[PDB]
Design a binder for this molecule. Structure first.
Ligand SMILES: [Mg+2]
Ligand SMILES: [Zn+2]
Ligand SMILES: [Zn+2]
Lengths: 106, 90, 1269
DNA sequence: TAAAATTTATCAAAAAGAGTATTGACTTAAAGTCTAACCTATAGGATACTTACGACACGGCG
DNA sequence: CGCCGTGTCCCTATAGGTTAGACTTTAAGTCAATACTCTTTTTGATAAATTTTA
């Protein structure tokens, strides 16, 4: 049988002289390791980047352009709070409170 | 038993190198303006295909003149003298 | 590395730390995604992500912004894929940051458990700790636990007293209920038992209730005893106890469960202190403790000396193999093809993701521990599938292919494609015989030389202006356009083509021929290389390769060209010798017929002699006319042939030079025509060219003349042989197969005896086996008699007997079976059928007789197949053992050496030549000199010792020469040259690059196959195998220990032999020697009171080389092994020179065993190389003197190979897992210096033209010719 | 033995397209963009069900 | 320290994202009229070396 990994091949000389000049950019990770990322000259350098370590790393250059935090994953508290009201959990809390403190005073 | 139908064909790569050489010589037969217009029009110098307006800008003429030089050069290369040499690669 | 060269000089294994892992990886895979389902492009942060692993398309990033070379080395700022070449996906790796630690499966479960020794725990115990089934205490203080104990035994007394308050509450309550039983039993009128059945019920209630109270009190006593005896670094079960212990004693200690706790254990493991304690134990301990310390001492110091900090066993961040090595090929049609490493990696990634999720949620300990267990299980599965449980399987219940199954067994790289490789510029075809080629030339079908040289012919017919460019040339060549052929001859001339056959049993399976374009489609092979290739023409096929580089074609033209490799590597006999048909031709050419046409008779008186001929030209003219037969005796007058030595010394004395001189000779015309083939310098022969005579002639002519003369002479002999084989009239017709007239009388005479034996059996005079034996012997006698009558019946010009007695082919037994009697035919089991067959194949057999013949022949065919299969194994082992015997120095300058028997003495007194001198004395270099009767020196030190000097020695009258050998060469790494003596292939001294170990292994294990068995001593190929394996002989027989007379006694149903010492004090007693054996016969049988040697063999049989080593030193065992193997090979009549067996035996006797450690580094029972042993003793005699006591050991070839230093070859041998893991544990460093480690990594092998004495030679035009230029 | 005649030299003129543009005009290729619309990722659903498919080496025993 | 056995090699509702589909711009392409001067071609139109004729 004849198969090939879906892809392509080029046949051109790998000229090592006449290329597009690069520009190495530093991206500090949360632990602080530095991972070089070569970029072209006329190229908008991003503030953040997924580094070689695999964790998000920000530019060594001072940018700090807002964390851009997302909404939290629905919690167990969220899934409980809808079906039940605060004051309604209040009476149950007092029942357990009196139970345990009756044990305490005993 | 799986032939990789993407591998270097050996003869294809060397043939492409020979084509590069022969085409370079033939284009060098063209005049300076002619060689420049062809190389830029087909991106033989950097891999970037320049178009008529860019070529007329870097030579400081109008794109109609560039297209005319283009047609003239193509017709000249169609001449069997410098054509039959490169026919086989196609 | 990332960038590689051919200067690789050290392959160093060693466990890898996760710190080294997250610095290998060029990214991190986190999603178990292979390729998008709809667009078929790799995913981001998946197992094929181009950002992590590099582009799938040459110089294109993912989103397509940068798509050309001019943008290289840069990273596109939006899709993040570094634009570069698309083979980095072969080499860039990933890693996986695990959420919890995990351990290996190789350094833990593989026997012996390296971790199990390391932390001092048994394997099964650890298999409960690293699969989350037992806690572990990591540290403890307990100082204040001493005082806290007192408080808690007080609280324990309080608790147990409350328990007893409950218990006497039970006593009191049931006592009241029991007096209620009294008051409702005695008061009432119930049955005396019934009224007390409630009594018994209450008392039983108190019995079981005090059982309750007692059992819980024992529980509390147990928990208290446990807290008092709480101690660290141990294995504990009953998680419930652990909970109660923690939540009441949360301070004072830390204890955890699983791979993180063991990480801490290794963290808190000090190899130093443990190692000192282990040294103390092995130094002062004894028995089992000392040995257990030894094995533990090994691995702990191994880690100490490697300084590798065993953390490599707890595998944190796990590295991901590059995508291309685990391809997702799409077979046309959309059917994708995984590699089964995709699936295992996906499993591990899924389980890690789910574990991370569960950890975030905070699932109960059950779920988190189960998922950690499943992570561990899947990591273990990926690094090896089938270990630590049943295999992880998939569709069709086929086990998967873990990384290990790619590097183990027979299908791993280390036992596969790193052995053999398909090669381009190659072809094969069926072969035919060409009796027109010269020895160097060969045929080559045109339709196979136009598709091997296609680049050469392409270039050439571009250079000659037949094509405008290369593409036109390719199309033209592919269409076989008329003028391609004319160029093809030009590109072929003087360009070798290696012609290999399979199996390549020995070194001459590959030879280089200059191709000669011939038509047809069958490779025309020269007929004189059929013996080397073992190539009949029943449809054999051969593979044509093609050397390319200047070095390769020079190699073929100089080293492997057929004309140069005439002689065999084993015994030096020629293999271009004219065989089969050519020998018959030359026989018929040189045989002499008395009473033939045109003889020389001196009869006179009436007419002259009519036998003289003035010249061989006149003789040929008279032969064309029907006067002279070619085989009549005549007197020619020769002027261009050298007379034999006697006639030269007669007619000319000293300096008869032939080209002008004339001399007469009474010979046949055939012999003159034959000696015209041989060169001028060679004397006249004048014999009858039996095959052995031609062997001797070519051997002499190759030992004294250059090689080109040998090749041309052999070619001439071939031509003459065929031309006169056609004329010999050797045909086969049934009128030409004559039966013996006296056969029926012989058969009746032996039939009467068979009848009588059968009658004596029928009357009960002898049992069933004895009559079979008698019939077997009678019919053997009948076979001998029929064969003898047949032999004396035939004439000499009978073609069948002419073919046989020529030595062309076939023994006499086949003639005996063609005409006469077939004889005895074997059982399927091996015995002889007592019938027996009494009809020749000319007379035609009857039905049953043919059936029995079928028994025999079918068993024979199956046995031959299996025997070939086994010969293969022996050759492989011998090559493994002797891969490192390569000639380094010109001269070791040693003086030791073996002695040679060399024509033992006759009883009457002469020098009868020892028959096996050509294998044991020739091609050797003397260390001493030959002097006799205080006379002059005869042969000086260091001479090749060929035939003329052996003749001189036997003429001067000596019998023993002390000659060098590869056994006592004093060079460090391999033999010197003068020890190896003459290279049997060249005829000159061996070179300084030869891989004589491989030549020896091939020459020993090549002539197997044709090695039969016999009718309980093993006597064939298995005997040789057990000799080289150094087994204890199947038929072990006793060997003496000291001289003196023998104490012989025949005990109860078997023997009793003892040796009387002459000073050996204690008598050595051999009691259990069976009655089935026989006593040794020599010179007479072993009689009582006979004086035995130090190592005389008691029983005729064979002895174990270990015992003869221990008794009679290394020399004796070397001689014993050489003699014993050559006894087998002489029995089959195969010529093998002893130096090959000596190379192998020298490889056997390298190491020594340590019985006393001295005080330096050497474990008792361990085996170490002799050179290292002596160097260590030289070092340690200083700095305080103590010797390590060493004893020589004899180990089999297999064991000898097992102790190779290089982990690479060691793993390539077998047991890959164990080799790699131990090499890793010890940070082994191979130096890439063998001829097997350097055939893997592709660099230049250190043998032949690879060593730096030859690979770095400088070639420059000489100043004189350069100036003339 | 010398002209009347049949073919190599030189321009005259036109031109002819090259050496060269321009300009305007028309075109389309694309392409940028707006809108439309159609997969695809994502989550959420209420009686009650509760454990599947021959040799080499170490440990026990004597 | 020897002897042995056995272990192991069905649906809805949200939301995003995707492409497809097509209109009003571009921006790049191709056509055609004139135009200007100029080396060279090309066919034309007169002079001079080789052959006919009396
Ligand atoms: Mg065959
Ligand atoms: Zn990109
Ligand atoms: Zn030596």
């Amino acid at each position: 049988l004849r198969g090939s990994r879906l892809g392509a091949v080029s046949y051109e000389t790998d000229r090592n002289h006449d290329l597009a000049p690069r520009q190495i950019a530093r991206y500090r990770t949360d632990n602080g390791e530095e991972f070089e990322v070569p970029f072209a000259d006329d190229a908008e350098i991003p503030g953040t980047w997924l580094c070689r370590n695999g964790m998000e790393g920000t530019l060594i250059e001072g940018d700090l352009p807002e964390p851009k935090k997302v909404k939290p994953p629905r919690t167990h508290w969220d899934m409980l709070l809808e079906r039940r009201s605060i004051e309604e959990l209040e009476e149950l809390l007092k029942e357990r409170l009196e139970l345990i403190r009756s044990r305490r005073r005993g | 038993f799986i032939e990789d139908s993407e591998a270097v064909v050996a003869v294809d790569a060397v043939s492409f190198t020979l084509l590069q050489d022969q085409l370079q010589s033939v284009l060098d037969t063209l005049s300076e303006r002619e060689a420049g217009v062809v190389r830029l029009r087909f991106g033989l110098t950097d891999g970037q295909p320049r178009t008529l307006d860019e070529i007329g800008q870097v030579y400081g003429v109008t794109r109609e003149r560039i297209r005319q030089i283009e047609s003239k050069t193509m017709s000249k290369l169609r001449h069997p003298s410098r054509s039959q040499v490169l026919r086989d690669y196609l | 590395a990332m960038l590689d060269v051919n200067f690789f000089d050290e392959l160093r294994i060693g466990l890898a730390t996760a710190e080294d892992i997250r610095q290998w990886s060029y990214g991190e895979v986190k999603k178990p995604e292979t390729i998008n389902y709809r667009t078929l492009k790799p995913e981001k942060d998946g197992l094929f992500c181009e950002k992590i692993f590099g582009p799938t398309r040459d110089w294109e990033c993912y989103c397509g912004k940068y798509k050309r070379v001019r943008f290289k080395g840069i990273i596109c700022e939006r899709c993040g894929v570094e634009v570069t070449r698309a083979k980095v996906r072969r080499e860039r790796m990933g890693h996986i940051e695990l959420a919890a630690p995990v351990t290996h499966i190789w350094y833990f479960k593989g026997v012996p458990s390296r971790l199990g020794y390391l932390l001092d725990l048994a394997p099964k115990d650890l298999e409960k700790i690293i699969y989350f089934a037992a806690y572990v205490i990591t540290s403890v203080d307990e100082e204040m636990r001493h005082n806290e104990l007192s408080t808690l035994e007080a609280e324990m007394a309080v608790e147990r007293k409350a328990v007893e308050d409950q218990r006497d509450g039970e006593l009191e309550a049931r006592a009241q209920k029991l007096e209620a039983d009294l008051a409702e039993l005695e008061a009432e009128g119930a049955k005396a038992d019934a009224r007390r059945k409630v009594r018994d019920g209450g008392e039983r209630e108190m019995r079981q209730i005090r059982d309750r109270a007692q059992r819980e009190l024992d529980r509390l006593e147990d928990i208290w005893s446990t807290f008092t005896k709480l101690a660290p670094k141990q294995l504990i079960v009953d998680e419930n106890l652990y909970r109660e212990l923690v939540d009441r004693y949360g301070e004072y200690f830390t204890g955890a469960m699983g791979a993180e706790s063991i990480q801490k254990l290794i963290e808190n493991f000090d190899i130093d202190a443990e190692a000192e304690s282990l040294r103390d134990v092995i130094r002062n301990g004894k028995g089992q403790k000392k040995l257990r310390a030894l094995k533990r001492l090994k691995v702990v110091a191994a880690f100490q000396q490697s300084g590798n900090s065993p953390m490599g066993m707890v595998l944190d961040a796990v590295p991901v193999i590059p995508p291309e090595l685990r391809p997702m090929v799409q077979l046309d049609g959309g059917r994708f093809a995984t590699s089964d490493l995709n699936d295992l990696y996906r499993r591990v990634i899924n389980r890690n993701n789910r574990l991370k999720r569960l950890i975030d949620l905070g699932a109960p300990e059950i779920i988190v521990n189960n998922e950690k267990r499943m992570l561990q299980e899947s990591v273990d599965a990926l690094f090896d599938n089938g270990r630590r449980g049943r295999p992880v399987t998939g569709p069709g219940n086929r086990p998967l292919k873990s990384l290990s199954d790619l590097l183990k067994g027979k299908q791993g790289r280390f036992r596969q494609n790193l052995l053999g490789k398909r090669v381009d510029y190659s072809g094969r075809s069926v072969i035919v015989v060409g009796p027109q080629l010269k020895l160097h030339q060969c045929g080559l079908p045109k339709l196979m030389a136009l598709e091997l040289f296609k680049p050469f012919v392409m270039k050439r017919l571009v250079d000659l202006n037949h094509a405008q460019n290369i593409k036109s040339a390719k199309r033209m060549v592919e269409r076989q356009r008329p003028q391609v052929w004319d160029v093809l001859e030009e590109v072929i001339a003087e360009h070798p083509v290696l012609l290999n056959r399979a199996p390549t049993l020995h070194r001459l399976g590959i030879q280089a021929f200059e191709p000669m374009l011939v038509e047809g489609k069958a490779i025309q092979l020269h007929p004189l290389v059929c013996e080397a290739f073992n190539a009949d023409f029943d449809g054999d096929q051969m593979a044509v390769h093609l050397p390319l580089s200047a070095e390769a074609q020079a190699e073929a033209r100089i080293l492997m060209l057929s004309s140069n490799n005439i002689l065999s590597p084993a015994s030096g006999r020629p293999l271009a010798m004219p065989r089969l048909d050519m020998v018959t031709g030359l026989y018929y050419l040189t045989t002499e017929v008395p009473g033939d046409t045109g003889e020389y008779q001196p009869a006179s008186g009436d007419h002259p002699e009519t036998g003289v001929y003035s010249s061989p030209a006149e003789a040929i003219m008279a032969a064309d006319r029907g006067v002279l037969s070619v085989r009549a005796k005549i007197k020619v007058r020769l002027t261009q042939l050298r007379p034999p030595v006697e006639i030269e010394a007669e007619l000319f004395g000293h300096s008869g030079w032939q080209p002008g001189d004339a001399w007469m000779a009474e010979t046949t015309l055939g012999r003159v025509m034959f000696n015209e083939l041989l060169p001028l310098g060679y004397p006249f022969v004048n014999k009858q060219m039996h095959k052995k005579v031609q062997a001797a002639i070519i051997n002499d002519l190759a030992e004294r003349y250059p090689m080109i003369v040998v090749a041309q002479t052999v070619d001439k002999l071939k031509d003459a042989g065929f031309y006169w084989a056609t004329r010999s009239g050797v045909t086969v017709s049934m009128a030409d197969v004559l039966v013996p007239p006296r056969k029926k009388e012989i058969l009746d005479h032996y039939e009467e005896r068979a009848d009588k034996v059968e009658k004596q059996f029928q009357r009960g005079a002898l049992n069933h086996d004895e009559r079979n034996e008698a019939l077997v012997e009678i019919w053997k006698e009948a076979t001998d008699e029929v064969g003898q009558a047949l032999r004396e019946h035939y004439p000499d010009d009978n073609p069948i007997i002419t073919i046989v007695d020529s030595g062309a082919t076939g023994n006499f037994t086949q003639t005996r079976t063609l005409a006469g009697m077939k004889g005895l035919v074997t059982n399927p089991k091996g015995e002889f059928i007592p019938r027996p067959v009494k009809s020749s194949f000319r007379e035609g057999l009857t039905v049953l007789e043919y059936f029995i013949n079928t028994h025999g022949a079918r068993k024979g065919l199956a046995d031959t197949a299996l025997r070939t299969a086994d010969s293969g194994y022996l050759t492989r082992r011998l090559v493994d053992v002797s891969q490192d015997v390569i000639v380094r120095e010109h001269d070791c300058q040693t003086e030791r050496g073996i002695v040679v028997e060399l024509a033992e003495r006759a009883p009457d007194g002469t020098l009868i030549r020892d028959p096996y001198i050509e294998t044991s004395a020739y091609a050797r270099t003397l260390g001493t000199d030959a002097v006799d009767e205080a006379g002059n020196v005869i042969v000086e030190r260091g001479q090749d010792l060929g035939d003329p000097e052996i003749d001189a020695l036997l003429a001067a009258g000596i019998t023993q020469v002390k000659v060098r050998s590869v056994l006592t060469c004093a060079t460090s790494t391999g033999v010197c040259a003068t020890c190896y003596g003459r290279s049997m292939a060249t005829g000159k001294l061996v070179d300084i690059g030869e891989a004589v170990g491989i030549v020896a292994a091939q020459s020993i294990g090549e002539p197997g196959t044709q090695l039969t068995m016999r009718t309980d001593i093993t006597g064939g190929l298995p005997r040789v195998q057990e000799l080289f394996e150094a087994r204890v002989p199947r038929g072990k027989a006793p060997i003496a220990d000291v001289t003196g007379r023998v104490r012989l006694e025949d005990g109860e149903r078997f023997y009793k032999i003892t040796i009387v010492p002459d000073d050996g004090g204690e008598e050595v007693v051999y009691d259990k020697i069976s009655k089935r054996q026989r006593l040794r016969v020599f010179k007479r049988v072993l009689s009582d009171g006979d004086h035995v040697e130090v190592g005389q063999q008691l029983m005729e049989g064979s002895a174990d080389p270990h015992e003869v080593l221990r008794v009679q030193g290394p020399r004796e065992v070397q001689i014993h092994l050489v003699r014993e193997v050559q006894e087998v090979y002489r029995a089959q009549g195969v010529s093998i020179h002893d130096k090959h067996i000596e190379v192998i035996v020298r490889q056997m006797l390298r190491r020594v065993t340590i019985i006393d450690s001295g005080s330096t580094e050497f474990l008792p029972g361990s085996l170490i190389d002799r050179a290292e042993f002596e160097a260590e003793n030289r070092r340690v005699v200083a700095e305080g003197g103590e010797p390590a006591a060493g004893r020589p050991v004899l180990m089999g070839i297999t064991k000898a190979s097992l102790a190779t230093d290089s982990w690479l070859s060691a793993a390539s041998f077998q047991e890959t897992t164990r080799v790699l893991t131990d090499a890793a544990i010890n940070c082994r460093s191979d130096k890439l210096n063998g001829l097997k480690e350097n055939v893997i990594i592709g660099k230049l092998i250190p043998a032949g033209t690879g060593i730096n004495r030859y690979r770095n030679i400088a070639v420059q035009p000489t100043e004189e010719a350069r100036a003339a230029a």
